[PDB]
Design a protein around this motif. Sequence first.
Motif, PDB file in Angstrom:
ATOM      1  N   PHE A   1       0.894  -1.199  -0.036  1.00  7.57           N
ATOM      2  CA  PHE A   1      -0.144   0.135   0.039  1.00  7.57           C
ATOM      3  C   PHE A   1       0.852   1.275   0.093  1.00  7.57           C
ATOM      4  O   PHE A   1       0.501   2.098   0.572  1.00  7.57           O
ATOM      5  N   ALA A   2       2.102   1.203  -0.642  1.00 10.25           N
ATOM      6  CA  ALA A   2       2.958   2.350  -0.649  1.00 10.25           C
ATOM      7  C   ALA A   2       3.538   2.470  -2.110  1.00 10.25           C
ATOM      8  O   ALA A   2       2.704   1.938  -3.066  1.00 10.25           O
ATOM      9  N   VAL A   3       4.583   3.209  -2.359  1.00 13.77           N
ATOM     10  CA  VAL A   3       4.714   3.695  -3.812  1.00 13.77           C
ATOM     11  C   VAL A   3       5.787   2.911  -4.297  1.00 13.77           C
ATOM     12  O   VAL A   3       6.878   2.495  -3.245  1.00 13.77           O
ATOM     13  N   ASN A   4       5.911   2.335  -5.540  1.00 20.22           N
ATOM     14  CA  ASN A   4       6.972   1.992  -6.044  1.00 20.22           C
ATOM     15  C   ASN A   4       8.197   3.098  -6.225  1.00 20.22           C
ATOM     16  O   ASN A   4       8.094   4.080  -5.964  1.00 20.22           O
ATOM     17  N   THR A   5       9.365   2.248  -6.686  1.00 22.06           N
ATOM     18  CA  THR A   5      10.372   3.257  -6.919  1.00 22.06           C
ATOM     19  C   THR A   5      10.296   4.095  -8.157  1.00 22.06           C
ATOM     20  O   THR A   5      11.169   4.871  -8.215  1.00 22.06           O
ATOM     21  N   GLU A   6       9.390   3.771  -8.735  1.00 19.43           N
ATOM     22  CA  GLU A   6       9.089   4.550 -10.051  1.00 19.43           C
ATOM     23  C   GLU A   6       8.040   5.641  -9.973  1.00 19.43           C
ATOM     24  O   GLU A   6       8.100   6.453 -10.625  1.00 19.43           O
ATOM     25  N   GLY A   7       7.445   5.364  -8.726  1.00 18.97           N
ATOM     26  CA  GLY A   7       6.332   6.439  -8.448  1.00 18.97           C
ATOM     27  C   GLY A   7       4.797   5.859  -8.819  1.00 18.97           C
ATOM     28  O   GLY A   7       3.983   6.434  -9.433  1.00 18.97           O
ATOM     29  N   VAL A   8       4.526   4.318  -8.267  1.00 17.09           N
ATOM     30  CA  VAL A   8       3.711   3.828  -8.790  1.00 17.09           C
ATOM     31  C   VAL A   8       2.997   3.297  -7.458  1.00 17.09           C
ATOM     32  O   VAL A   8       3.336   2.555  -6.867  1.00 17.09           O
ATOM     33  N   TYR A   9       1.659   3.768  -7.437  1.00 14.60           N
ATOM     34  CA  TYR A   9       0.756   3.229  -6.278  1.00 14.60           C
ATOM     35  C   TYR A   9       0.370   1.604  -6.524  1.00 14.60           C
ATOM     36  O   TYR A   9       0.235   1.425  -7.757  1.00 14.60           O
TER      37      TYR A   9
END
Lengths: 52, 52, 519, 52, 519, 51
Positions: free
Chosen positions: F28-36
């Motif tokens: 439920f957090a963000v990826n290293t690329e900016g993806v929820y």
Amino acid sequence: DNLQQQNTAPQIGTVNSQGALPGMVWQNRDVYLQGPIWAKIPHTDGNFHPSP
Amino acid sequence: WLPGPCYRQQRVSTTTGQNNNSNFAWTAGTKYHLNGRNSLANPGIAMATHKD
Amino acid sequence: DGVGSSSGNWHCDSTWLGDRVITTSTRTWALPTYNNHLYKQISNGTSGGATNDNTYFGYSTPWGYFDFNRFHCHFSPRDWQRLINNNWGFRPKRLSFKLFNIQVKEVTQNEGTKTIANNLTSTIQVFTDSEYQLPYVLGSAHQGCLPPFPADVFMIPQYGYLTLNNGSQAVGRSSFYCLEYFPSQMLRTGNNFQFTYTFEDVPFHSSYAHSQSLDRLMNPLIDQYLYYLSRTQTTGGTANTQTLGFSQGGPNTMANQAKNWLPGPCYRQQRVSTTTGQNNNSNFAWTAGTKYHLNGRNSLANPGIAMATHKDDEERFFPSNGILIFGKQNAARDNADYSDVMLTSEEEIKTTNPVATEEYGIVADNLQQQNTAPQIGTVNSQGALPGMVWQNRDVYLQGPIWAKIPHTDGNFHPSPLMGGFGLKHPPPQILIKNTPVPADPPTTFNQSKLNSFITQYSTGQVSVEIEWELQKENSKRWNPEIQYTSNYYKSTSVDFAVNTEGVYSEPRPIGTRYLTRNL
Amino acid sequence: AHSQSLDRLMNPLIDQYLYYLSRTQTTGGTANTQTLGFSQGGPNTMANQAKN
Amino acid sequence: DGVGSSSGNWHCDSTWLGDRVITTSTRTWALPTYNNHLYKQISNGTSGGATNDNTYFGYSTPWGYFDFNRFHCHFSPRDWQRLINNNWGFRPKRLSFKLFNIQVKEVTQNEGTKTIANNLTSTIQVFTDSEYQLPYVLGSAHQGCLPPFPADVFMIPQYGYLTLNNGSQAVGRSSFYCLEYFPSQMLRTGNNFQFTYTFEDVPFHSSYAHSQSLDRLMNPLIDQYLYYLSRTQTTGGTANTQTLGFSQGGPNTMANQAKNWLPGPCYRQQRVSTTTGQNNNSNFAWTAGTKYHLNGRNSLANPGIAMATHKDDEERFFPSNGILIFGKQNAARDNADYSDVMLTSEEEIKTTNPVATEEYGIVADNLQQQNTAPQIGTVNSQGALPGMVWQNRDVYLQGPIWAKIPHTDGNFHPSPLMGGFGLKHPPPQILIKNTPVPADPPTTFNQSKLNSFITQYSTGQVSVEIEWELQKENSKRWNPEIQYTSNYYKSTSVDFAVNTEGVYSEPRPIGTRYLTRNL
Amino acid sequence: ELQKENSKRWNPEIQYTSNYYKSTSVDFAVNTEGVYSEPRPIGTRYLTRNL
């Protein structure tokens, strides 16, 4: 009808008279100019959607 | 949502040449049995008469 | 309020107020000790000869509970006759309760000397659960009710319950309760305890039989004006041809006339005769019984939905598991004979509901064509239809009264299957226990708990009163009706009386629907 | 989620007082005959007990 | 208020008021007689196999004392879950007390006939010491607490104490007290006794885990502006020379950045694995244990100051004597096996405190010169430093609650080592005894005192209520946190439930720090 | 608008919790690329009540 398996092909069946289900929706038969108007609901203990 | 109830009835055409050659008025009619009696379901529950 | 004082009186009476009825009764109880003041988990699984449908998981507690969910706990047979012979229906309104004149005693056994002496300091605990926070066990038709005859002292049952399971093992959602986690009033000889409850509005009970039939609502003299299909093939001889023919419904063709209503639901059951020579020679009790499957389990539908027992002139037939069966006095528990049970009969509702042993109707199969003959099919279990009409199973003098409606989200026509009344907030349960008391403890200290108590038990009285609300009949029938009466010829012993040995008995069941009313 | 099951609403300790059909054929051997047999629902026969 | 009257009710409940909690409980006790109504001096010295660290000198008294300094004496596991899953801290405010429904009995033994009859005139004595004039014995984690499960009757312990000593002999400053020198209310069946106490303000309890680490308080994107020493020797090759080099702290050199705080104290302990094959083959329990020496005695530091148990991925390790160890149901008293105890774990505080098995830091030794290489040294027990920060050991459901702060002149951060609350005026002690009664005295006179009494003992009920004050969490975390839950898969028996024999049990310890909060 | 539970169950029930062991990325957090992202569905029926 049955429980399909690797050696068992699935089978079906046609239902021809289905009772009421939660979520059902329907309408009443229309009236006519030379048709009836009302009718006495019988005086019982239980009934379901009493429309003549 | 789900459609209304159903209580199947026998279909018959007005075009005379498209019906079976037998008297099936009473023998095939949709009845309901009660107290050893077999009453005729008339006019049965509200259902559509014919598709397009 | 001391040891040398009464704490109540013996109230057991009845009164009539035109439209109201008050009932009052008093018995004598006795409370042993259970399980040596221990909670005990119990379970049975598929090990041994047991099958999947008989697994359970639950607990047993030292507590006991009162039960009066039976009509013969409040009505004399005389009063039962008074009610069922002149009224059209009734329902209960409020009730009270009372415990008093408590005694707690202990017993000492030493070499054949079993001595019993008073113990004027010990106590008992009592409380009720107004909030319905405990498993509800009443309404499951268990024994130990108040004795029908008041002159007899009775025993108080034990309490228990169940929870989810997977075989003989429990699951994460399993629950366990500690009864001592609730408030309670502790009592010594010379106190009392009482409370009052109120019923919530609820439809009356249908104590009457219909003087008319559904399919017989028309006028015997005036034909309808609507037509019906009556002829498709000519009848000129062997050169018959297809045609269309219509006619009006009339007094000679009453089966085809159009009607407005449908009979109640149906859930077929297997038919079996009482005449022994008319049944198959096989054990078909369980293999042929009407069941419903749930969570890999196959429970027996008992007594199934309210349906008529037998059509005319066939009182020797009865559904396999669709009726109530009461036992006569001093019946065996297992594999009893037919002569010692009492069979009910619900043929009074046969004017509206389908008989529990016959199909519901005949419904189409396929699309007839010139080269295709039409086919039909028998429907054996029909759900509800708009326009359906039906009645509830009747009540009995030795039958139940109410049952707690489960607390779910959705239900449909919540009327108990065993008959009676369906309540959201039934009367609260009542729980009772003798407070433990230990023997001599050791003279040095020890951490372990105690398990050595003194054998005790307590007795006392109990009383309940219920007001019943009535509905006077207003018929204009001319000819006399049927009423409940007794036999007139001489006999060995009076029915509903005492044996020469001191045994109360009941000869036959008592229905309710004796009056008549127009549909 | 419910902490209980429908078919499991009874008391595990106290048998019912209502009877149910339990036996139709004798079991004397190979000379079995038709009969009637009834019993009380109990903690060992919880499947046959009457429910609501 | 007579023999034929109750003297109380059974209050055992809980209620929730958003920020308040009330707890209530009731048990059943029994009081034997101790020492035949005699005070008895007791001592153990260096004679025999005893060693200098096990000498004592003190007395034993006929009195008994109540004890409820354990959390499971007031909280159902359900309520424990409710509390520890939604709050950030709590503290207690006031409490009440009650004794009632007393019974005193005697027993007669004659040739296998052990008979027990009431004795409706004898009495018992009760009193409390508001002024703290007696030796305080609670808070030393002794057995005999109120049983966790309410359905079980328990035994009342015995009272005693100690005083200064020099071996098995006493000294001039030794003290001795006579309990009967205080006021007390004497009680017969039909009276009661009660009182109320109030707690003094005291910090809340830290029921939360930090979502951040001390050494990780900086911004991962912006370098500092302060410099640090980074280079002293040139690196031109093998012709290296001395030089000075400085750099800025940054996200790639986060270890060298300047910080503002220091971790908590440290008091090293010996590390031992649970995996048996990874320990030395010698008995090092006492020879290697972390002790502190006092007055020629070498006491064991237990459980030592609050320190982290194990770093990441090493839950198989634990300090020798630095953690709490609870026993499972039915454990041996001496030389029990690992399978039957329950080990705690305090790794939640590892974000601030040093782990109890590692050194604190590395500190200089000598003065480096051109011909002298620098040397270091490992510090193993560091006192307090200005700027230090630390946390307290967590509490447990079957752990203690409070403990009396000693009445000295000076102390530093008075928080009990076993966790809980530190009070100047803890709740008062409660003392109880059965009044003696003599047998037949001789018919002529004699000067000597009596020693012939009747064997007696008494039982009754007891109830305590405590109000707890709460502190609602106010986090803005996005992702879900951790909460206490139970297993979901099927099992033989429900945890925290009763055995098939009637035995309560507890499967595992329950910490407190489950929520999270920013540092 | 809410409805507070009022159970008297003794043993603890089931509650929604997250995994405790270490992992590559927070749920439920963000990826290293900016993806929820969302790792799993969340039902509702977790508490218990008597029938």
